[PDB]
Subunit: 406 residues, 2 copies
């Protein structure tokens, strides 16, 4: 697997520990302190060892020093100290290292060495975060949580979770201009942030998008929408039947793959079950929309809150004809078999998914079929243990309790 | 010169046009489509002409019916269609056609009918590519890009470019066994892929190579390292001073030119400046190292990311003695005059090279000096146009690794 490092600070007595998770090597650990201006280095050669600082330290940040993925676990008392850093003056640690703390924190919740209550509490720091790197990495760990809830009988916890996610980014969403100015980095943030607010019924985005869509639609698609915003404008348009049929009527007349790809995303986010079924039938048949573009559709329908059973329902009835157009071993088959399944988190989808692929005889032993049964089993345990926690965490968070006064 | 053909498909209205770039003939264009089960053979006899297809088509692949080099330009809207082919089910078009699409795409970037942003996006399909010919032809167009960056003050984009280059082939790198099994095709892919991965600090190649080198080093060169692997093992070994001095000490005790040639590459990629300078002095004088091997050394020494100024500075100071040992007109001098220069891409290296050869009077008028001044002038324009673009392309690709995209 990958190397995992535990850190346990006790005053000025910095204990260390290495464990190559998922066994021993000479792990070069670096750290930075509230006191330190420079990077301190330590070559950890044993399972456990100890390092000592001159004075006690307000916060200790360990990153290893290799390439690729590694998780630095700071234990309970150390995570709390790091949280206070990112809440008061997060500019101390670097932009990319802030993302690293989030990746470590939330993936430790899955491993089991950290309760979700502490990771969710760390996420609350985003409210002041500006740089693109933590925002996406924060959005990187949070979206798969409610994506699993969509596939379950969970609407109140889902709607309260989705409002919470918008609550952190609300300050940043309202500052994003609806243009294509600034550097390439933030423009990626803009495009993806406007898409986020508008998808989650954030009124200042939707109403703003509908107005832009009207001016573009009523002009028969002749007004130059800025590129970054276009994703959100098209997404809200395809919700109505009138906007959807028109949105496709311009998909044909397009010779711009970027414009073509954004519409395709839009045409799949509709909660209409009749319109999506047609996208599957027509992209599969390969006349009005290319069969090449079918994976980029079966996937995004399988991620629709309402269209996820149709993608699963389409794959089972249309397995044999699909392998001739794509071939088992190809990446398209693999990408397709995962997108319709790897977000299920029930004790019944396990037999449904395992049962279907076992019956396929020699057509049952793909690396993508094994890789998805694992991620489903991971999701079952993750949800069965951490669901009730997110329910009560989101409760006790609305409370600002009206104290800090008395 | 070579013939270039542009194609513009609009529904079933496939427009084509011939232009012998760098003028008119009966160009036999053949093509295959998503619908087509049969090779179509349209004989293009005029500058521009049009043919009509029965049903609409998802993608059209054009080849010309001559041999040698030709570039098929598929226009902007048409290249996008072919990229989607090689990403979803690249097995549709042939192995050699996949290499052909890559060679044309990147060489169209130099001609100017294709932006670098789109060609680099086509390269992203390599991650699923297995066959050697596209892998090499992809490696053939990408490597000269950073070898121009090595000779310039470009380090963050260079390391970020090289990681991307390994990122594409990484999946294929991990499947290559460290043996001499499979066919010569698989062996050729193995040898150069391990050689490539190990060069770019790809740790899974380093750890396996360093361990192999020590066991070969500690056994005083008595255990038979697999031949394909040997290139990478020697390359990483010669980086340390301790590994270099020994690696040269076994160069002598060899009566095997294949083993002899592998060491030659290894001893030159070391970032040590003193050790390289000595290789130049001794190969030239001809006692420790043959004078025959000086060209095959001065060139690749000039190809070192850090040793390139020594080769160029050595060639200038040692011109006169070089003409007597090799003679102007011979191909060896030509190979030497190009290898130390043809990757410079500055407005000052151009005048530096032009200035040196002009001063030689009657000794200054070769085909290799003109052919290298041309490739230098080509490099200046290519970088001046496409450098800043690749900088932000590597930016906006790391962000294509966000995992939101589902919302």
């Amino acid at each position: 697997g990958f190397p995992l490092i535990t850190i346990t600070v006790r005053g000025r007595n910095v204990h260390m520990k290495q464990e190559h998770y998922m066994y021993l090597w000479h792990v070069p650990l670096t750290f930075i302190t509230s006191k330190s201006d420079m990077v301190h280095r330590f070559l950890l050669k044993t399972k456990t060892d100890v390092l000592i600082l001159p004075e006690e330290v307000e916060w200790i940040k360990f990153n290893v020093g290799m390439n690729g993925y590694y998780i630095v676990h700071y234990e309970d008392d150390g995570w709390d100290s790091l949280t206070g850093l990112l809440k008061g003056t997060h500019t101390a640690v670097s932009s990319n290292d802030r993302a690293s703390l989030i990746n470590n924190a939330f993936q430790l919740v899955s491993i089991g060495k950290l309760s979700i209550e502490k990771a969710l509490d760390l996420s609350l720091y985003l409210k002041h975060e500006t740089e693109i790197m933590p925002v996406f990495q924060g959005l990187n760990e949070l979206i798969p949580m409610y994506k699993l809830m969509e596939k379950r009988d969970m609407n109140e916890v889902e709607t309260q979770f989705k409002a919470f996610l918008i609550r952190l980014l609300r300050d940043l969403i309202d500052k994003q201009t609806w243009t294509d100015e600034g550097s390439v980095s933030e423009r990626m943030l803009r495009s993806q942030l406007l898409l986020l607010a508008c998808v989650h019924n954030y009124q200042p985005c939707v109403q703003r998008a509908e107005g832009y869509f009207r001016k573009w639609k009523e002009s028969n698609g002749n007004l130059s929408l800025p590129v970054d915003v276009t994703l959100a404008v098209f997404a809200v348009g395809a919700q109505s039947t009138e906007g959807w049929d028109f949105l496709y009527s311009k998909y044909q007349f397009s010779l711009s793959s970027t414009e073509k790809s954004q519409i395709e995303f839009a045409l799949c986010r509709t909660q209409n079950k009749e319109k999506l079924q047609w996208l599957l039938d027509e992209s599969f048949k390969g006349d009005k929309i290319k069969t090449q573009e079918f994976p980029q559709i079966l996937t995004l329908i399988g991620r629709n809150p309402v269209g996820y059973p149709l993608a699963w329902q389409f794959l089972r009835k249309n397995w044999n004809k699909l392998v001739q157009k794509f071939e088992l071993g190809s990446s398209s088959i693999a990408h397709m078999v995962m997108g319709t399944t790897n977000q299920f988190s029930t004790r019944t989808r396990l037999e449904e998914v395992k049962g279907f692929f076992s019956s396929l005889k020699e057509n049952s032993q793909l690396r993508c079929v094994q890789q998805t049964i694992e991620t489903i089993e991971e999701n079952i345990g993750w949800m069965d243990k951490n669901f009730d926690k997110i329910r009560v965490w989101l409760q006790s968070e609305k409370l600002e309790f009206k104290a800090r006064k008395f």
